[PDB]
Amino acid sequence: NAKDVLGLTLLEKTLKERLNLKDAIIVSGDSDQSPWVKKEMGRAAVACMKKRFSGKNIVAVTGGTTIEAVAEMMTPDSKNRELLFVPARGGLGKNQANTICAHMAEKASGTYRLLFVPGQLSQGAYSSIIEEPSVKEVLNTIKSASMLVHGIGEAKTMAQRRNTPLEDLKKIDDNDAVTEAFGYYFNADGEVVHKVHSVGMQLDDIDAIPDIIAVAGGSSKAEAIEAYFKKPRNTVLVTDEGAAKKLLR
Amino acid sequence: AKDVLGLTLLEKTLKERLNLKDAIIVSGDSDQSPWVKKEMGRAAVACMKKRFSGKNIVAVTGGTTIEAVAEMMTPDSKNRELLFVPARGGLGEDVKNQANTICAHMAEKASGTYRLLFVPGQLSQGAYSSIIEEPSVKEVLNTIKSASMLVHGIGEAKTMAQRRNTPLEDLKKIDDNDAVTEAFGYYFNADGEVVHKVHSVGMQLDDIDAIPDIIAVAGGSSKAEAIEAYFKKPRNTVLVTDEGAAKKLLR
Ligand SMILES: O=C[C@@H](O)COP(=O)(O)O
Ligand SMILES: [Cl-]
Ligand SMILES: [Cl-]
Ligand SMILES: [Cl-]
Structure with missing residues (x-):
């Protein structure tokens, strides 16, 4: 198996033990180094x-x-x-x-x-x-x-x-925001510290959405990804080794 | 990833079809998408x-x-x-x-x-x-x-x-004898039989039998027929390929 030889299966199991995740999908490589990894x-x-x-x-x-x-x-x-x-x-x-x-x-x-x-x-x-x-x-x-x-x-x-x-x-700096998703900035504990003036979806609304898929990777995002999932989001994360390996080691 | 992309099942189908030690298949077709070769x-x-x-x-x-x-x-x-x-x-080859x-x-x-x-x-x-x-x-x-x-x-x-x-x-000679695949300077027909050998020093086809780990790496839709033909004979080999080749081969 490709995922066995590339070590992705064991890695996804561990990433799901570490983060608040419904499931983890990890592709090979680091998108910060290799642009095609985003594809x-x-x-x-x-x-x-x-x-x-x-x-x-x-x-x-x-x-x-x-x-x-x-x-x-x-x-x-x-x-x-x-x-x-x-x-x-x-x-x-x-x-x-x-x-x-x-x-x-x-x-x-x-x-x-x-x-x-x-x-x-x-x-x-x-x-x-x-x-x-x-x-x-x-x-x-x-x-x-x-x-x-x-x-x-x-x-x-x-x-x-x-x-x-x-x-x-x-405000964003003083409250130590580290991650951003859908118009919200969160601190290292995954707590909202600032919200962009917007219309549409609110953080409270995600609870009622049956399927949420976050797609994010690259070694530079390891800290943001970790912070975002410090709270349960009932989300499947699609990420890459860049981010996953940096987070886990 | 391989699960959702259907690659895990594709690999088992390919491994069986070609009598491989293992098959490893990556997403997409290296003939349309150059990064797939990477x-x-x-x-x-x-x-x-x-x-x-x-x-x-x-x-x-x-x-x-x-x-x-x-x-x-x-x-x-x-x-x-x-x-x-x-x-x-x-x-x-060119250098x-x-x-x-x-x-x-x-x-x-x-x-x-x-x-x-x-x-x-x-x-x-x-x-x-x-x-x-x-x-x-x-x-x-x-x-x-x-x-x-x-x-x-x-x-x-x-x-x-x-x-x-x-x-x-x-x-x-390669044309007259209907070669369809090539590996390490040997040209083979659709049955995996040698039809033309390039004269050169080093490893000969009989020598591969004593090498315990052989990894073949080849892909793209244009290669499905060549990959199929090469593996018409037992090679005790692991194939690394892509969706482009594997899906067309199993078509
Ligand atoms: O002997 C087979 C290889 O040289 C094929 O070359 P390629 O990887 O550029 O198709
Ligand atoms: Cl990479
Ligand atoms: Cl519209
Ligand atoms: Cl994005």
């Missing part, structure tokens, strides 16, 4: 998604480069189950999840619904917009997600990449 | 390390697939002794694809040692008779006879004949 995580994640699909599916997705790799490897479902894709969230104050969710849907021969992309407005304007019947319909669809597919990032990297207010950068 | 390299390396003894004499062939094995080689964590030797040579080049790269990457052997293919009878008696050549031939492992590729006959410097007379 193999993509392949593995798609295969995992397809094993979990029910007859009808609403799949919420995030917008980072590893989820893009999942979209690129997406293929139509052999079982022809019904597939609607949506972004898990949209920022307030470009939505990259929108791009990913459209690409993934086209690749799966599914359908999708995107979130509005507003200019800079007052809170009152945003509050009025989210109650608009057309917008509310997409938010309710996101609330009904049967699956979430998301990345995990280093906190400082994510906060700098965005256009994060100086007040919030200080 | 993953075959990685899996081959793991395979080699699983089978290393305390002291090792590893015979290596050339070609771009074994070069990918070399590229993916890393030092042994158990720090076992590793000497790499080219299994033959004088096969008419970049010669066993003598690949063996040295693999040794470097493994932090092992290596022996050089360069004896080109089209020496006169007199020059060839004289060169094979030179101490450096005789010594390395003896080392090759002692190989504890062989790592080799498998090619399509036509593809190999074309890439190599193959004399007009021998192309006809």
